Amino acid sequence: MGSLSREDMESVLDKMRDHLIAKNVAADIAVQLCESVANKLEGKTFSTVTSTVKQALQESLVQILQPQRRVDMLRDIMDAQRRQRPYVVTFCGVNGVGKSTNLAKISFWLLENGFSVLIAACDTFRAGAVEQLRTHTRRLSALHPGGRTMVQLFEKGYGKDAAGIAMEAIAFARNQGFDVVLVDTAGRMQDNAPLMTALAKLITVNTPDLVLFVGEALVGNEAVDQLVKFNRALADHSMAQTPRLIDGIVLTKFDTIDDKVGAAISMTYITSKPIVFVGTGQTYCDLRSLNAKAVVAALMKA
Amino acid sequence: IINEEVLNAMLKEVCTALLEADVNIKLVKQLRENVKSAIDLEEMASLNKRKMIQHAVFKELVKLVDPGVKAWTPTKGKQNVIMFVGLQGSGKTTTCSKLAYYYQRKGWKTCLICADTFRAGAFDQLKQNATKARIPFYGSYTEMDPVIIASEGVEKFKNENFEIIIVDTSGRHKQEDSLFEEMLQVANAIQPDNIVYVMDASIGQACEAQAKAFKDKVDVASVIVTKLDGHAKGGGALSAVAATKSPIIFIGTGEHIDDFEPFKTQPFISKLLG
Numbered sequence: 001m002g003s004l005s006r007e008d009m010e011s012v013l014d015k016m017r018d019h020l021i022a023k024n025v026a027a028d029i030a031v032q033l034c035e036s037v038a039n040k041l042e043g044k045t046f047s048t049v050t051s052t053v054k055q056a057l058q059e060s061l062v063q064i065l066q067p068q069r070r071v072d073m074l075r076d077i078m079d080a081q082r083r084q085r086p087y088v089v090t091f092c093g094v095n096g097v098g099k100s101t102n103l104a105k106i107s108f109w110l111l112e113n114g115f116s117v118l119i120a121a122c123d124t125f126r127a128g129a130v131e132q133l134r135t136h137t138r139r140l141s142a143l144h145p146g147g148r149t150m151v152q153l154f155e156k157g158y159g160k161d162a163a164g165i166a167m168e169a170i171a172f173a174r175n176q177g178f179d180v181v182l183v184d185t186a187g188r189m190q191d192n193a194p195l196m197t198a199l200a201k202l203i204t205v206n207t208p209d210l211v212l213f214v215g216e217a218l219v220g221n222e223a224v225d226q227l228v229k230f231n232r233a234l235a236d237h238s239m240a241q242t243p244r245l246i247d248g249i250v251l252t253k254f255d256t257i258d259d260k261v262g263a264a265i266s267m268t269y270i271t272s273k274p275i276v277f278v279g280t281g282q283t284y285c286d287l288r289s290l291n292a293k294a295v296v297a298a299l300m301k302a
Numbered sequence: 303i304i305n306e307e308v309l310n311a312m313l314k315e316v317c318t319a320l321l322e323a324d325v326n327i328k329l330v331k332q333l334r335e336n337v338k339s340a341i342d343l344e345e346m347a348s349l350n351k352r353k354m355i356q357h358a359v360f361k362e363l364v365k366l367v368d369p370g371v372k373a374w375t376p377t378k379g380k381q382n383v384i385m386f387v388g389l390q391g392s393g394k395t396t397t398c399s400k401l402a403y404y405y406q407r408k409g410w411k412t413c414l415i416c417a418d419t420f421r422a423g424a425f426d427q428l429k430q431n432a433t434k435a436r437i438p439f440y441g442s443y444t445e446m447d448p449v450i451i452a453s454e455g456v457e458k459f460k461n462e463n464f465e466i467i468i469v470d471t472s473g474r475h476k477q478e479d480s481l482f483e484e485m486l487q488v489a490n491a492i493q494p495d496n497i498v499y500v501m502d503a504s505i506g507q508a509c510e511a512q513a514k515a516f517k518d519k520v521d522v523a524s525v526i527v528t529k530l531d532g533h534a535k536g537g538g539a540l541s542a543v544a545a546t547k548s549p550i551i552f553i554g555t556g557e558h559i560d561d562f563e564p565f566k567t568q569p570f571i572s573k574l575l576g
């Protein structure tokens with residue numbers, strides 16, 4: 001209230017909703033976003049109305065992008081070392097989004113910081129999946145970060161049960177004293193219950209330290225469905241009383257969407273979980289952390 | 303009055319469904335005024351409003367998937383070169399083998415060329431695919447110039463008189479000019495009879511910009527929308543057809559070689575619509 005207060009707000013709220021949608025925010029997220037602005041603004045100069053919703057939207061977008069506390073991988077690995085157990089990380093996501101490429105980027109980063117990593121080749125299905133990992137392991141061994149071993153690929157070819165390989169890889173990792181295990185998994189659609197179950201088994205059987213959903217910033221409304229479905233298998237198929245869920249997000253192909261940046265919000269909206277990494281290209285250094293201001297700035301200018 | 307409210311009611315419902323099928327919001331707003339022009343509440347006698355409106359919506363979607371250009375087809379006995387382009391991860395390499403297998407079971411002399419000199423495992427992947435399907439392949443673990451590979455592959459399979467010569471290329475995006483130039487050099491080199499832009503059905507609002515730039519750089523003539531298995535909507539395909547001035551020829555419905563069928567419009571739009 002008042003009625004033409006609400007009337008002016010909703011009319012400019014609508015222009016903002018159609019703006020976030022055009023920039024690849026998931027429509028129903030764009031909708032829920034504005035309805036939240038309404039509740040916050042209502043009860044309390046047309047330009048001020050425009051500027052008050054524009055300003056208030058911007059404030060919430062920033063809060064959505066950075067929930068909880070920033071994830072601190074190198075610090076948490078140290079805790080794993082103190083307990084003398086590998087810090088285990090699982091990558092999952094749908095077909096094609098950049099799981100295997102971005103796992104390599106991340107290990108480069110870990111390796112340069114002095115940590116040994118065992119890459120578990122647990123996409124035993126898709127053709128090439130293991131040669132492709134193998135090429136990266138051979139290139140990462142060049143970092144040397146000679147005596148001892150900093151990168152090794154743990155692999156058993158194709159055809160075998162990825163939840164079992166991942167258990168072996170971790171046990172091997174603990175046995176050889178590797179700091180980190182990076183578990184690659186195979187691309188799977190989120191409505192494919194077999195694949196969704198097998199993923200859930202790999203996770204609940206092995207209980208990694210960190211489960212990382214990989215999403216591409218090119219996805220549209222499926223950004224929400226992928227994440228909802230992945231978290232539902234993880235929850236539905238857990239054996240623990242405490243359901244193990246997705247810990248964070250790697251958002252890839254951020255260099256392909258220009259300013260249509262809105263997939264960052266679809267994914268930070270539906271989880272209270274952070275974007276740990278941004279993929280900004282196809283090479284080892286194309287790994288950024290997410291800048292909320294730069295994202296929200298992009299989302300307003302269009 | 304009642305009729306206006308009814309029409310605005312169905313239309314809002316159509317438009318919300320269309321946006322969540324990942325249609326470009328500009329397309330959705332345009333269709334909305336297109337159906338409003340094409341419908342007159344006043345002429346409607348007592349008949350049912352909804353059914354005429356649903357038809358009106360559905361008829362305007364059908365215009366959007368039809369580019370009005372007939373899809374290209376290979377010609378028996380001649381050397382048909384087909385080139386695959388698309389964004390990173392869009393499904394190009396898997397679809398190459400699907401299209402080859404499609405044509406090989408229909409009695410065509412098909413082969414495959416991996417000319418992706420960048421992606422780790424690009425040859426292995428295509429090689430393994432091709433081997434599992436008994437389809438001849440060509441590539442190199444050592445060569446790094448994809449124009450050389452695509453040239454040597456195309457000529458080799460022609461001297462062996464193949465009918466379907468499918469070239470797989472690396473994933474590339476529009477804002478990477480060196481890749482988009484390399485793509486131009488591969489096309490000019492092998493002179494393909496048909497370029498296939500491949501798009502992931504889960505693509506969002508960025509589709510029109512990418513797809514347009516692929517068509518501005520190279521004569522895209524066809525479209526294949528991948529990852530339409532099960533529940534995917536694939537509304538970006540409208541931007542893709544309009545941007546590339548090309549028809550959608552097939553759809554990919556899974557990771558296996560036989561998860562592949564020719565594109566048909568009505569069922570695609572029915573899934574899109576509801």
Ligand SMILES: Nc1nc2c(ncn2[C@@H]2O[C@H](COP(=O)(O)OP(=O)(O)NP(=O)(O)O)[C@@H](O)[C@H]2O)c(=O)[nH]1
Nearest residue numbers: 095096097098099100101187253279280281390473
């Ligand atoms: N431009 C760009 N391309 C990227 C990025 N991350 C990954 N890619 C590209 O995406 C494509 C697929 O990468 P890949 O690691 O195979 O993805 P995946 O999730 O492991 N695919 P699969 O499910 O088939 O195993 C490759 O062309 C890779 O170079 C990124 O941040 N930017």
Ligand SMILES: Nc1nc2c(ncn2[C@@H]2O[C@H](COP(=O)(O)OP(=O)(O)NP(=O)(O)O)[C@@H](O)[C@H]2O)c(=O)[nH]1
Nearest residue numbers: 095187390391392393394395396473529554555556
């Ligand atoms: N479910 C499903 N998965 C598909 C379909 N088409 C391809 N895929 C999967 O999605 C990924 C596509 O990989 P790929 O064929 O490498 O695509 P690409 O365009 O060649 N990638 P790159 O840019 O690296 O060359 C693979 O994981 C493949 O198994 C489809 O129709 N359905």
Ligand SMILES: [Mg+2]
Nearest residue numbers: 099100123185
């Ligand atoms: Mg992979």
Ligand SMILES: [Mg+2]
Nearest residue numbers: 394395418473
């Ligand atoms: Mg490929």
